[PDB]
């Protein structure tokens, strides 16, 4: 890719790969494109930085349906580190990527027998369970794993997503509360919890959804989803025929402020880039949904 | 000044002390890293530690969730749950000090540039046998100890973090302590008046539509 539609040094490629590693991006094609070149034409330049790149490129190639590079990287990693446990996990993932689940299960059982306090093998077994569509067994195994190993946020988020996919929202809301308690400075969790509470039930659930949408918008002022949700929840609560006058007028005031902010934001957006297609349209949405 | 010194002593006694102490400190750091420790923990220990951390985090940050969930978790944790190596670090310093005193002591090394009192003299002139010499002039061992003591900041700078220098108990007890600490905590919601705080001013839509939308990688 160097001198090929781009002009970057090997340091720039390494930094881009590291940044793609920090945030869990899953653009397999670009990762493979950069990684194969980095492995081939700059192997000696990287003193000790090639093993994590090997792992990342192998995973991306497995995701990209290109197994020759995966096998090459796996062979290199196995040759460098004999008897390691991460390499066994990679081998199991390669096995299960070809719809060979019994071998992966026996490999993970062997890993757990060698070391009983290992975490990745249990997660891979749960992934194997999920790959076959067996949702209830996966949920049960994930619940057992969380019972054994609490404080793992990835498992909590995965369980919340699985519960969302099954149209069971109370337990998903509980899991999102558990996630939000550890990370009170993250607006995305508040936004998702507000969405779940909006989708769950009726009046008090809508009140909590509005509260957490407001909290998410307070944490970050660039969150347009939070603003839209706040406006929609305020409008929904205002028109409910089982609310007192005080709550009705408070929600009307909230909706008016939200609509004004939305209109100002869309005017700001239209000022820079000239399209003028939604500023003429969002106003109609605001007008037709008034009161 | 008062004394006339041979340049050869400056060339061959001063620098080697500094080089030796510097590289000895570096070797000590690397060796300490090499055999620092090897610890293993059973599953119950880590599980209980994670449970304790979760309980502490609940106690600290229960003010960001609805009160009903906080008290639901507080009904839990109360009924069902809570109630159901150096020898090389220090000895080489003394050994090297003794070896240096053996193979280097016997001549004036250098002089500090500030006046001192007679109290300083017994410390800085271990090797010499004079009587009326001033306390500013130092011996070799005192110079070695001064060089050893004056390198902590240099080691912290040129080397990662700080090294190369000298300076639960019972699960049931911890469970009882956390049970007693958690019992006196009460919910105080932090979202009671968030709307009024939001309504005070317009949103900060400044400095958000600069630059340009990204097209591809790099």
């Amino acid at each position: 890719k160097v001198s090929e539609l781009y002009d970057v040094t090997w340091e720039e490629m390494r930094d881009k790969m590291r940044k793609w590693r920090e945030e869990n991006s899953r653009n397999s094609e670009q990762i493979v494109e950069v990684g194969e070149e980095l492995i081939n034409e700059y192997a000696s330049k990287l003193g000790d930085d090639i093993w994590i790149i090997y792992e990342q490129v192998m995973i991306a190639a497995l995701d990209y349906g290109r197994d020759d590079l995966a096998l090459f990287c796996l062979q290199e990693l196995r040759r460098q580190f004999p008897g390691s446990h991460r390499v066994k996990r990679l081998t199991g993932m390669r096995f299960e990527a070809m719809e060979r689940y019994d071998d992966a299960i026996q490999l993970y059982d062997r890993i757990l027998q060698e070391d009983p306090t290992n975490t990745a093998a249990r997660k891979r077994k749960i992934a194997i369970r999920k790959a076959q569509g067996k949702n209830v067994e996966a949920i049960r195994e994930l619940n057992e794993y969380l019972e054994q190993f609490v404080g793992d946020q990835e498992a909590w988020h995965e369980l919340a997503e699985l519960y969302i996919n099954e149209h069971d929202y109370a337990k998903a809301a509980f899991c999102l509360e558990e996630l939000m308690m550890t990370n009170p400075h993250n607006h995305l969790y508040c936004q998702q919890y507000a969405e779940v509470k909006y989708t769950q039930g009726g009046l008090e659930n809508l009140e909590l959804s509005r509260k957490y949408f407001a909290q998410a918008l307070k944490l970050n002022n660039r969150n347009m989803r939070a603003l839209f949700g706040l406006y929609m929840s305020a409008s929904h609560i205002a028109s409910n025929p089982k609310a007192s006058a005080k709550t009705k007028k408070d929600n009307m005031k909230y909706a008016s402020w939200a609509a004004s902010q939305i209109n100002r934001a869309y005017q700001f957006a239209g000022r820079s880039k000239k399209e003028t297609k939604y500023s003429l349209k969002a106003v109609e949405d605001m007008l037709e949904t008034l009161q | 000044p008062e004394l006339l010194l041979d340049s050869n002593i400056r060339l061959w006694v001063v620098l080697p002390i500094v080089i030796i102490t510097f590289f000895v400190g570096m070797i000590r750091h690397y060796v300490s890293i090499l055999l620092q420790s090897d610890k293993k923990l059973t599953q119950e220990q880590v599980s209980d530690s994670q449970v304790l951390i979760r309980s502490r985090v609940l106690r600290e940050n229960g003010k960001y969730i609805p009160k009903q969930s906080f008290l639901t978790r507080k009904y839990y944790f109360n009924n069902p749950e809570d109630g159901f190596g150096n020898v090389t670090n220090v000895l080489p310093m003394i050994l090297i000090g003794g070896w240096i005193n053996m193979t280097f002591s016997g001549f004036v090394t250098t002089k500090v540039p500030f006046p001192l009192t007679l109290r300083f003299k017994p410390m800085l002139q271990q090797g010499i046998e004079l009587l009326t010499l001033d306390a500013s002039w130092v011996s070799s061992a005192s110079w070695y100890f001064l060089n050893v003591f004056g390198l902590r900041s240099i080691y912290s700078l040129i080397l990662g973090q700080d090294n190369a220098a000298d300076q639960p108990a019972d699960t049931n007890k911890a469970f009882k302590t956390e049970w007693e600490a958690l019992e006196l905590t009460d919910h105080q919601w932090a979202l009671d008046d968030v709307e009024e705080e939001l309504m005070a001013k317009d949103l900060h839509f400044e400095g958000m539509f600069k630059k340009e939308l990204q097209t591809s990688i790099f």
Partner: peptide, 21 residues
């Protein structure tokens, strides 16, 4: 609010339901 509106309807450690004022 009107027209387009969709209603989707259908034991992780601690889970309680009632009272505790």
């Amino acid at each position: 609010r009107f027209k387009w509106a969709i209603e989707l309807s259908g034991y992780p450690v601690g889970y309680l339901d009632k009272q505790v004022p």
